[PDB]
Swiss-Prot record, chain A:
This is Gamma-tubulin complex component 6. It comes from Homo sapiens. Belongs to the TUBGCP family. Component of the gamma-tubulin ring complex (gTuRC) which mediates microtubule nucleation. The gTuRC regulates the minus-end nucleation of alpha-beta tubulin heterodimers that grow into microtubule protafilaments, a critical step in centrosome duplication and spindle formation. It is linked to Microcephaly and chorioretinopathy, autosomal recessive, 1: A syndrome characterized by microcephaly, cognitive impairment, underdeveloped retina and choroid, and epilepsy in some patients. The more anterior parts of the retina, near the periphery and pars plana, have a grayish hue and diminutive vasculature similar to retinopathy of prematurity. Visual impairment becomes evident during the first year of life. It is found in: Cytoplasm, Cytoskeleton, Microtubule organizing center, Centrosome. It comes from the Eukaryota. The chain holds residues 1482 to 1516 of 1819 of the full protein. Component of the gamma-tubulin ring complex (gTuRC) consisting of TUBGCP2, TUBGCP3, TUBGCP4, TUBGCP5 and TUBGCP6 and gamma-tubulin TUBG1 or TUBG2. TUBGCP2, TUBGCP3, TUBGCP4, TUBGCP5 and TUBGCP6 assemble in a 5:5:2:1:1 stoichiometry; each is associated with a gamma-tubulin, thereby arranging 14 gamma-tubulins in a helical manner. Gamma-tubulin at the first position is blocked by TUBGCP3 at the last position, allowing 13 protafilaments to grow into a microtubule. The lineage of its organism: Eukaryota, Metazoa, Chordata, Craniata, Vertebrata.
From Swiss-Prot, chain B:
Belongs to the TUBGCP family. It is linked to Microcephaly and chorioretinopathy, autosomal recessive, 3: A disorder characterized by congenital microcephaly and chorioretinal dysplasia associated with poor vision and nystagmus. Variable ocular anomalies include microphthalmia, retinal folding, retinal detachment, optic nerve hypoplasia, absence of retinal vessels, round areas of chorioretinal atrophy, and attenuated electroretinogram. Most patients have mild developmental delay and mild learning difficulties. The chain holds residues 192 to 286 of 667 of the full protein. Component of the gamma-tubulin ring complex (gTuRC) which mediates microtubule nucleation. The gTuRC regulates the minus-end nucleation of alpha-beta tubulin heterodimers that grow into microtubule protafilaments, a critical step in centrosome duplication and spindle formation. This is Gamma-tubulin complex component 4. It comes from Homo sapiens (Human). The gene is TUBGCP4. Component of the gamma-tubulin ring complex (gTuRC) consisting of TUBGCP2, TUBGCP3, TUBGCP4, TUBGCP5 and TUBGCP6 and gamma-tubulin TUBG1 or TUBG2. TUBGCP2, TUBGCP3, TUBGCP4, TUBGCP5 and TUBGCP6 assemble in a 5:5:2:1:1 stoichiometry; each is associated with a gamma-tubulin, thereby arranging 14 gamma-tubulins in a helical manner. Gamma-tubulin at the first position is blocked by TUBGCP3 at the last position, allowing 13 protafilaments to grow into a microtubule.
Swiss-Prot record, chain C:
Component of the gamma-tubulin ring complex (gTuRC) which mediates microtubule nucleation. The gTuRC regulates the minus-end nucleation of alpha-beta tubulin heterodimers that grow into microtubule protafilaments, a critical step in centrosome duplication and spindle formation. The chain holds residues 507 to 607 of 1819 of the full protein. Belongs to the TUBGCP family. The gene is TUBGCP6. It comes from the Eukaryota. Component of the gamma-tubulin ring complex (gTuRC) consisting of TUBGCP2, TUBGCP3, TUBGCP4, TUBGCP5 and TUBGCP6 and gamma-tubulin TUBG1 or TUBG2. TUBGCP2, TUBGCP3, TUBGCP4, TUBGCP5 and TUBGCP6 assemble in a 5:5:2:1:1 stoichiometry; each is associated with a gamma-tubulin, thereby arranging 14 gamma-tubulins in a helical manner. Gamma-tubulin at the first position is blocked by TUBGCP3 at the last position, allowing 13 protafilaments to grow into a microtubule. It is found in: Cytoplasm, Cytoskeleton, Microtubule organizing center, Centrosome. The lineage of its organism: Eukaryota, Metazoa, Chordata, Craniata, Vertebrata. It comes from Homo sapiens (Human). This is Gamma-tubulin complex component 6. It is linked to Microcephaly and chorioretinopathy, autosomal recessive, 1: A syndrome characterized by microcephaly, cognitive impairment, underdeveloped retina and choroid, and epilepsy in some patients. The more anterior parts of the retina, near the periphery and pars plana, have a grayish hue and diminutive vasculature similar to retinopathy of prematurity. Visual impairment becomes evident during the first year of life.
Amino acid sequence: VLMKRSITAPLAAHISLVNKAAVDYFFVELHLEAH
Amino acid sequence: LHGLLLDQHEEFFIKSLKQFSLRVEILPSYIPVRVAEKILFVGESVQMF
Amino acid sequence: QEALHNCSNEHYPVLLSLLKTSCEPYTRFIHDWVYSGVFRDAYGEFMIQVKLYWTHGYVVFLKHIAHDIYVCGKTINLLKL
Amino acid sequence: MIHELLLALSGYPGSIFTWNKRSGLQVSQDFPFLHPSETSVLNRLCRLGTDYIRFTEFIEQYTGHVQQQQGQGGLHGIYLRAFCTGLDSV
């Protein structure tokens, strides 16, 4: 079998955490939602 | 278990929904048709969900 | 692609061991750009490369993850600005 | 006779056991130094090395000749190669 189940799995779960922190950083700090 | 194949241009008695068809003619006689139907059903089911 | 092209050979575990060390640098590349946002440029052999300011040039392994990393790095790169 | 026979049987044709593809291994059979008594036993031994050379030629020709392969099972495919592996192990 050819697959990644030990490389991308501890990586893709971290990508989403970074993305959610950035989306949070926009709203609750720079107040785009108030614009 | 994964709906994956690496076989190109040879037979293995199987070719969202579809993408598998039953090569009924090539099938080994000493392995019955009945289990191969279940195998085709399982591979399609895993590819679907 | 020589791996997916193969399924069984006397050189199949040999090629697994060869690719397993031939992918050792690239995993380190990706382990740089996600946690730092700055990859040490070699010759531009990194597959991704580089006011609103975003005009990065981007447009094989799974490209399903390539654009994911391409957005995962440019956002940290904005925080550096 | 001592080393020559083993060399023939291993699949290296000599100048006593001359390889053809129409007659395989063959005694020279034109000397009055060897006689009909030993000749027959020798021909019986020639058969095995002929078949052996055929076997090894087919296995080598189709296994380890491409990376891993459009398609014809009598010339290509994984199944023919796995056949040649099983034939080599027997």
